Amino acid sequence: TMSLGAENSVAYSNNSIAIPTNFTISVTTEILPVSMTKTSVDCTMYICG
Amino acid sequence: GTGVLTESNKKFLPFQQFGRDIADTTDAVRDPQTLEILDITPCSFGGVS
Numbered sequence: 001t002m003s004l005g006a007e008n009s010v011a012y013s014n015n016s017i018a019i020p021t022n023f024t025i026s027v028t029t030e031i032l033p034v035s036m037t038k039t040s041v042d043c044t045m046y047i048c049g
Numbered sequence: 050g051t052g053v054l055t056e057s058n059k060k061f062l063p064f065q066q067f068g069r070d071i072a073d074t075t076d077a078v079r080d081p082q083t084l085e086i087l088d089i090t091p092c093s094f095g096g097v098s
């Protein structure tokens with residue numbers, strides 16, 4: 001059975017807060033197609049010979 | 050068939066007669082005389098704009 005995710009629990013209370021003291025500059029990628037290959041066909045040359 | 054006949058380097062086996070492409074159309078053929086081996090290629094063609 002696939003592991004749905006890493007189990008975690010955050011300590012919540014009604015008078016406590018958590019504030020970062022440091023940062024981290026991260027770089028991520030993302031690939032997106034734009035245009036495929038333009039194609040054309042010949043009717044008679046294909047249907048006939 | 051209509052096409053251009055050129056010298057071919059294909060090493061036919063002695064019993065082999067034709068040569069077929071992906072579309073099962075005779076690509077390389079053996080002439081009855083001289084037992085020569087040829088290539089059959091459609092003549093130059095294309096689109097006009």
Ligand SMILES: *[C@@H]1O[C@H](CO)[C@@H](O[C@@H]2O[C@H](CO)[C@@H](O)[C@H](O)[C@H]2NC(C)=O)[C@H](O)[C@H]1NC(C)=O
Pocket residue numbers: 010011012018
């Ligand atoms: C700030 O303090 C709170 C409580 O004093 C921390 O919350 C606990 O964290 C431990 C970590 O091992 C857990 O085992 C406890 O279950 C948490 N408490 C509760 C009530 O769930 C909190 O982690 C602290 N902050 C940081 C950044 O460590």
Ligand SMILES: *[C@@H]1O[C@H](CO)[C@@H](O[C@@H]2O[C@H](CO)[C@@H](O)[C@H](O)[C@H]2NC(C)=O)[C@H](O)[C@H]1NC(C)=O
Pocket residue numbers: 021022023
């Ligand atoms: C915030 O994080 C950075 C990197 O995680 C800390 O910079 C490191 O500091 C230690 C000790 O000064 C060095 O040995 C490392 O080489 C540093 N890393 C880099 C990438 O420069 C930085 O110290 C953290 N902020 C604070 C306030 O401690």
Ligand SMILES: *[C@@H]1O[C@H](CO)[C@@H](O)[C@H](O)[C@H]1NC(C)=O
Pocket residue numbers: 014015
């Ligand atoms: C936070 O919740 C507890 C009950 O879990 C309650 O007793 C307490 O009064 C709350 N805090 C405040 C500031 O009201």
Ligand SMILES: *[C@@H]1O[C@H](CO)[C@@H](O)[C@H](O)[C@H]1NC(C)=O
Pocket residue numbers: 082083084
């Ligand atoms: C026909 O071609 C073959 C192949 O070279 C040759 O051996 C034969 O003599 C030819 N016969 C005639 C009648 O041209």
